[PDB]
């Protein structure tokens, strides 16, 4: 099925970059930036909200409710922007794959492959969240206090387990997002092996459900980010 082989690969600063993944991430970023700018231009406190205003309001309200119910908004004002940007980034990345941006070589190529299908994207998001809430814990507990609480956790005599669970927080949070989207990239490829007259059915059903799967994955990734922040700050 020809897994891997990122296209547009180049080399700079003595390291290799997957061009296609960067292009997909840039496309998602520009879509999110366009949504943000269209909100900013058309954000009304007194008027009737636009569609983008309603979308952003619902997302922000959901994340703010999560923060309120897990760790006070006073303690964690900086985590709401993180949750909102994470959710929109992953949601748009996954949903842009629903567009028919794939063709035949004679293997199947795809103009836009979901960036989460690449290990670098999901690993970058997971490690950024990891560093972010570990820094938040350090700030709220101290440079030396925070590691002690992290190792101790809620049960002291389970110290190694915590040290594993902690290292499991990013890894899973990355791979859980990776395999879910990576797997999809294979199915669409696998379904491409069918002839056109029967390819549309499995492809149609798979991508119709992949809309919901990507929505749920973005929601889960953001929710677990908020939960890890609430855990690591107190």
């Amino acid at each position: 099925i020809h897994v891997g082989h990122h296209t547009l690969v180049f080399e700079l600063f003595g390291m290799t970059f997957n061009g296609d993944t960067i292009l997909a991430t840039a496309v998602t970023a520009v879509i999110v930036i366009a949504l943000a700018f269209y909100l900013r231009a058309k954000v009304t406190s007194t008027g009737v909200p636009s569609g983008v205003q309603l979308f952003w309001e619902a997302l922000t309200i959901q994340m703010r409710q999560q923060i309120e119910g897990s760790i006070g908004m006073k303690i964690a004002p900086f985590v709401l922007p993180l949750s909102v940007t994470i959710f929109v980034f992953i949601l748009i990345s996954n949903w842009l794959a629903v567009l028919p941006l794939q063709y035949g070589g004679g293997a199947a190529a795809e103009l836009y492959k979901a960036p989460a299908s690449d290990i670098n994207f999901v690993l970058a998001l997971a490690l950024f969240v990891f560093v972010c809430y570990h820094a938040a814990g350090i700030w709220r507990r101290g440079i030396v206090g925070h590691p002690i609480k992290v190792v101790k956790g809620h049960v002291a005599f389970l110290a190694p387990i915590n040290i594993v669970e902690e290292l499991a927080k990013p890894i899973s949070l990355a791979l859980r997002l990776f395999g879910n989207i990576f797997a999809g990239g294979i199915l669409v490829a696998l379904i491409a092996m069918f002839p056109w007259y029967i390819q549309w059915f499995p492809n149609a059903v798979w991508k119709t459900f992949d809309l919901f799967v990507g929505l749920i994955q973005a929601f889960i990734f953001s929710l677990l980010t908020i939960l890890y922040f609430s855990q690591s700050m107190e």
Partner: protein, 40 residues
Amino acid sequence: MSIFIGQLIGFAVIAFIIVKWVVPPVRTLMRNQQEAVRAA
């Protein structure tokens, strides 16, 4: 060529499904929210 046609038929099916069964509810929700906002 054939892959593109098959996937395009599939995407037409997806668009029809979302427009017929997914778009209506999330349109109401939006209209209800706007109505509530203009109410206050």
